[PDB]
Scaffold this motif. Structure first.
Motif, short mmCIF file in Angstrom:
data_model
loop_
_atom_site.label_atom_id
_atom_site.label_comp_id
_atom_site.label_asym_id
_atom_site.label_seq_id
_atom_site.Cartn_x
_atom_site.Cartn_y
_atom_site.Cartn_z
N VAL A 96 38.91 44.12 54.06
CA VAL A 96 37.90 44.53 53.08
C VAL A 96 36.54 44.73 53.72
O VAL A 96 36.09 43.92 54.55
CB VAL A 96 37.81 43.44 52.00
CG1 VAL A 96 37.13 44.00 50.82
CG2 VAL A 96 39.20 42.88 51.65
N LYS A 97 35.78 45.69 53.20
CA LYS A 97 34.45 45.91 53.76
C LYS A 97 33.46 45.57 52.69
O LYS A 97 33.85 45.36 51.55
CB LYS A 97 34.22 47.34 54.26
CG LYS A 97 35.21 47.82 55.32
CD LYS A 97 34.81 49.16 55.90
CE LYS A 97 35.98 49.77 56.67
NZ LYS A 97 35.68 51.17 57.09
N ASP A 98 32.20 45.85 52.97
CA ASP A 98 31.13 45.50 52.05
C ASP A 98 30.12 46.64 51.93
O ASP A 98 29.43 46.96 52.90
CB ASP A 98 30.49 44.23 52.60
CG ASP A 98 29.47 43.64 51.69
OD1 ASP A 98 29.00 44.34 50.78
OD2 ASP A 98 29.15 42.45 51.91
N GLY B 170 32.63 43.01 50.08
CA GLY B 170 32.88 41.97 51.05
C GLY B 170 33.92 40.99 50.59
O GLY B 170 34.49 41.14 49.51
N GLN B 171 34.39 40.20 51.54
CA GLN B 171 35.40 39.19 51.28
C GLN B 171 34.92 38.11 50.29
O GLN B 171 35.70 37.63 49.46
CB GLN B 171 35.88 38.62 52.61
CG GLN B 171 36.82 39.64 53.24
CD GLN B 171 37.12 39.37 54.68
OE1 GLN B 171 37.20 38.22 55.11
NE2 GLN B 171 37.24 40.44 55.46
#
Ligand SMILES: [Cl-]
Ligand code: NA
Ligand code: NA
Lengths: 241, 241
Positions: free
Chosen positions: A33-35, A207-208
């Motif tokens: 996952v990205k942010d 984000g995570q």
């Protein structure tokens, strides 16, 4: 573009796939996952994301691509001010690939010119399909994760875990991707009975540290037709083959 | 789930067993040490190891399992960024089985998608108990090696052999496993009389080329109650029967 039925035949085995659960996460189909940080680039993270998964699945390689490069060069969109999944794939074909996340790091809301020359190994897509509002579970099972749209409500942001079934938003205002479905059989806290709660598995771009390790689960039914909050009203999946 | 007392009763059974030393290493109970490298896989290596021992003991089979598959698939942990023993065992059951470390080789901090299908012979666990903070020696002798936590202080690490004794505890910051105890009788450097020094035997994850083949000895008392640095604040043992 293309034709659902046309491609589903080229992949789908006529076997009434298990409709209760399939999770691309545990099959090498979901990149980290990205942010998106403080820039409204959802549309970009989801479309880029579906491509990353197409690669991780089909051509079996893990690669993270530049979302920033879409925000800077996709002219059919409005950078941090929003965009449309299908427009992204469009501009993606026009640009003939996107620079890796490494040669073209993401820089959120920070002004930033578009430089297509910042790299030499551009990763691209042959074309992209649109999935029927009632063939999600099927497509997800044989084609892979799908870029979709959804109406995000204010309380939707607080979601920390479980099977979200809260308030929905006004209209489609956000882009995320579908990565699978599952079904936990909970107890009826009132009748106390074996009830089956089905759900879709979403991958956000916050984000995570948000929801379940960056992911959120949406209620739905065995058929995979109950698209809460407008779920997948707009649904596309890129093709590299 | 399984609450300590139900199974411990099925195994323990009073018994005036020797509380000074028992070493699973030389009883076919400790698989070779591994190396988590510059990736924060403390928790996975520790939990996996206890499983390896459970197989090596109960099912008399020597088997090493994939730590990489845990960092990639438990999701109840955070891969190279750290995790907790009990979360691992949970998810291990959810996934119902884990790939051998040969079909799912370790790649430390190297990006890597989760593919539960990366193998065909998955090895699993029925459930897992938590051992009392003051029942370690007792548990080790009859239950088998135990996954535990400890506070490693800054001056540690140079240890090449012997019975390391120097750093004190704090809040913990690493995951390892307990494999036994012993007691060497040194001479009294002050009065010169027969003194008894008791100690625990820990199994690290920094390859054979470190300390005595990778292991370290921590001070303790006959009762198996002196848990320096919190030795076993968190203690669990997976079950395959
Ligand atoms: Cl993050
Ligand atoms: Na992130
Ligand atoms: Na899991």
């Amino acid at each position: 573009q293309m034709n659902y039925e046309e491609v589903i035949k080229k992949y789908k085995g006529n076997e009434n796939f298990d409709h209760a659960a399939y999770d691309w996460r545990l099959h090498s189909g979901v990149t980290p996952v990205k942010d998106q940080k403080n820039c409204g680039s959802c549309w970009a993270f989801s479309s880029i994301g579906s491509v990353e998964s197409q690669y991780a699945i089909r051509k079996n390689k893990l690669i993270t691509l530049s979302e920033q490069e879409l925000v800077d060069c996709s002219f059919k969109n409005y950078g941090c001010n929003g965009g449309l999944i299908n427009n992204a794939f469009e501009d993606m074909i026009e640009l003939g690939g996107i620079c890796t996340d490494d040669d073209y790091p993401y820089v959120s809301d920070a002004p930033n010119l578009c430089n297509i020359d910042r790299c030499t190994e551009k990763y691209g897509i042959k074309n992209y399909l649109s999935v029927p509002d009632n063939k999600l579970k099927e497509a997800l099972r044989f084609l892979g994760p799908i870029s979709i749209s959804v109406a995000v409500s204010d309380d939707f942001a607080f979601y920390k875990e479980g099977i979200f079934d809260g308030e929905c938003g006004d209209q489609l205002n956000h882009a995320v991707m579908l990565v699978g479905f599952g079904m936990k059989e909970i107890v009826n806290p009132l009748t106390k009975k074996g009830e089956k709660h089905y759900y879709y598995i979403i991958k956000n771009s916050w984000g995570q540290q948000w929801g379940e390790r960056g992911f959120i689960n949406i209620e739905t039914d065995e058929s995979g037709l109950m698209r809460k909050c407008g779920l997948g009203t707009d649904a596309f999946i890129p093709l590299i083959e």
